[PDB]
Amino acid sequence: GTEIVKFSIHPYKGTVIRLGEEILPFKVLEMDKNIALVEMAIPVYKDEKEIELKLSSPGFQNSSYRIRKPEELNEKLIALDKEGITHRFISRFKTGFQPKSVRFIDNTRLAIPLLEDEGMDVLDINSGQTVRLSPPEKYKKKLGFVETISIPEHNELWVSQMQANAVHVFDLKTLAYKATVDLTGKWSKILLYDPIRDLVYCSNWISEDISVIDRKTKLEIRKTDKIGLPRGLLLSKDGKELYIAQFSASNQESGGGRLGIYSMDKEKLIDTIGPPGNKRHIVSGNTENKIYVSDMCCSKIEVYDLKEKKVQKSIPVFDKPNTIALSPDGKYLYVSCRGPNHPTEGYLKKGLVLGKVYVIDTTTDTVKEFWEAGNQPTGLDVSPDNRYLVISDFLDHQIRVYRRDGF
Numbered sequence: 001g002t003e004i005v006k007f008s009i010h011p012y013k014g015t016v017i018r019l020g021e022e023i024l025p026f027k028v029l030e031m032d033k034n035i036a037l038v039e040m041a042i043p044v045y046k047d048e049k050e051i052e053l054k055l056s057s058p059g060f061q062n063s064s065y066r067i068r069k070p071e072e073l074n075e076k077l078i079a080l081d082k083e084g085i086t087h088r089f090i091s092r093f094k095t096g097f098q099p100k101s102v103r104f105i106d107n108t109r110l111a112i113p114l115l116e117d118e119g120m121d122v123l124d125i126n127s128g129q130t131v132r133l134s135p136p137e138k139y140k141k142k143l144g145f146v147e148t149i150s151i152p153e154h155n156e157l158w159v160s161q162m163q164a165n166a167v168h169v170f171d172l173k174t175l176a177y178k179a180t181v182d183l184t185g186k187w188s189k190i191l192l193y194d195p196i197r198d199l200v201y202c203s204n205w206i207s208e209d210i211s212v213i214d215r216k217t218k219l220e221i222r223k224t225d226k227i228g229l230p231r232g233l234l235l236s237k238d239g240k241e242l243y244i245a246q247f248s249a250s251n252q253e254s255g256g257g258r259l260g261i262y263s264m265d266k267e268k269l270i271d272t273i274g275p276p277g278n279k280r281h282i283v284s285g286n287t288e289n290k291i292y293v294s295d296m297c298c299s300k301i302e303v304y305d306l307k308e309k310k311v312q313k314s315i316p317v318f319d320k321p322n323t324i325a326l327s328p329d330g331k332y333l334y335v336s337c338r339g340p341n342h343p344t345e346g347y348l349k350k351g352l353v354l355g356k357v358y359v360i361d362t363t364t365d366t367v368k369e370f371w372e373a374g375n376q377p378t379g380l381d382v383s384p385d386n387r388y389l390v391i392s393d394f395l396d397h398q399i400r401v402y403r404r405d406g407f
Helices: none
Strands: 002-010 016-019 026-032 035-043 051-056 063-067 077-079 087-094 109-113 120-124 130-133 145-151 156-161 166-171 177-182 188-194 199-204 209-214 219-223 229-235 241-248 257-263 268-277 279-284 290-295 300-305 310-316 321-326 332-337 356-361 366-372 377-382 388-393 398-404
Touching: 016 035, 077 087, 077 398, 109 145, 109 156, 156 188, 166 188, 177 219, 188 229, 199 229, 209 229, 229 279, 229 290, 241 279, 241 290, 257 279, 268 300, 279 321, 290 321, 300 321, 310 366, 321 377, 332 377, 356 377
Parallel strands: 002 077, 145 188, 268 310
Antiparallel strands: 002 035, 016 051, 026 035, 051 063, 087 398, 109 120, 120 130, 145 156, 156 166, 166 177, 188 199, 199 209, 209 219, 229 241, 241 257, 257 268, 279 290, 290 300, 300 310, 321 332, 332 356, 356 366, 377 388, 388 398
């Protein structure tokens, strides 16, 4: 006989599921833009016969979904790959509430701070094995875990907690809680590590400054003057300049952020470059003089020339580009796009349009491919071996895992 299963399909429109070359009818339970929760009857295949579901949809590559038993499909998301893309959907994994960022700590495991949950998930994308890392009760109850850095040379994993103006340190091998740095700034978010000076920098959203923490002692040793409203950070190759993504000019205005240039030696902001907007994330390019910056104002990635001290190119992407990451081989820049803000209710509410992921060819600085993901893609990283790209669907409390062709 049959088993009734419930799972999600993306896209729903035009999509057929067949089994043994016959239609397997399904019933729509819920619709969320192009993602459908559906229920379907699957026959119980006997005598070691594999159930191969065949999915097809206009403008999408065919997928086969193989299961030993109907039950295996329950609570799954099947997402089809858009025609012509070279990154293929592997899995969706549920996380705790509001996974704000993701970071590979090795080839397959991710550290995932949870903005509305009691710590950080550590999740293996091979198996879906998860474990929750938490600071002591007094901290963990405040929620608001944001960003990480991994420091394997000292066997540490650091996570900022904006709701406690703190940064927590875990042992990277044992996953045990190790220490907490209580900061004197407010609303700590982005972390950066400097291996030369052995310091960790922390962007403080509310106090509009950066905390400098001695990595060894777990103590904040100094903090900058106000340097705009910061988020992303990047330290120059020579270690002499700190690049600050100003999300805005200050907490008193909505925009006017530029790329800040902070002289480490002079301990001051010496320049601000690029046009005004909401600079978010910063990474180094595959060449020396090149940095990429996401600008949340204007659906764009900016390519800065550091010597020239300005933008050499803006690459158009989708609405609200947030986290970006260079592939280890430098061939691609990956971009998470949150999507347009709900037109009436703003960004705190699920949008009427799903977010997207973009792949930028760094040789030409043009978009090679892109596709639709879930509600508010926010976290993004690529595995150190080039193999996997992972994004967090922030309002869906999950990650989507993709695999690069040829890796």
